[PDB]
Design a protein around this nucleic acid. Structure first.
Ligand SMILES: [Zn+2]
Ligand SMILES: [Zn+2]
Lengths: 124, 123
DNA sequence: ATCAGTCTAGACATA
DNA sequence: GTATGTCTAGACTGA
């Protein structure tokens, strides 16, 4: 919770390189998800009701696994998990897929799931 | 041209266009080093314009364009601007010489970028 | 329609 | 076998 005066002031806050980039990455993901009925709704369900189980929300997997957004390359699940869960997330080594996930990064299928709540954070 | 002047000109700032053209030449050299005779041949053509030279080609893309540092153009146009007509407008101002066996229009695997394998025309 | 421009997966290179 | 970053043809998108 935030004070109205404060959230107004925060309205004018400058976002940094990282936050500006993350917006680009979300923009990129939405372009993909609009093309699939149920995806946008589903992802919004997952983000809004974390406690309640949700479906896989996938994008095409590249040959090397990486995704490029505005001249940065990363791994998709890592990217989106940083955005919506663990901003300080280090690498894919700090992530394990839940059993409920049908399309986890490691499975190297056509599709890769980017539902942040289909992943759990770990050590290594 | 004077030594003091060329010294002073040493410190001249190149503009976006010239800096880009340096990149485009760099890009072309990377390609030509890989082909024995190409670099020498291109140098022959540039240095002895009067004397006939061979085709110097690079791979042709599907759409014909070449990209160098986030700018797209047509290769013969690019390299003709560099070494001949800086004010060259488009491929419409260019016609290939008969001596050229890989001219832009021929839409082959290779496209010739020897600037002296082209002549400048109106539109 | 050409034409012109943006974005990135795949290739490739510097580690 | 990683990994990280760069470049650009091709795919795509608007005049
Ligand atoms: Zn999933
Ligand atoms: Zn030629």
């Amino acid at each position: 919770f935030t004070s109205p005066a404060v959230k107004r002031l925060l309205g004018w806050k400058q976002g940094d390189e990282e936050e500006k980039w993350a917006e680009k990455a979300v923009d990129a993901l939405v372009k993909k998800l609009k093309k699939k009925k149920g995806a946008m709704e589903e992802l919004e369900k997952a983000l809004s009701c974390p406690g309640q189980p949700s479906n896989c929300v996938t994008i095409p997997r590249s040959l090397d696994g990486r995704l490029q957004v505005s001249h940065r390359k990363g791994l998709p699940h890592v990217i989106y998990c940083r955005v919506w869960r663990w901003p300080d997330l280090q690498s894919h080594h700090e992530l394990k897929p839940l059993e409920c996930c049908e399309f986890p990064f490691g499975s190297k299928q056509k599709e890769v799931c980017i539902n942040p709540y289909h992943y759990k954070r770990v050590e290594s």
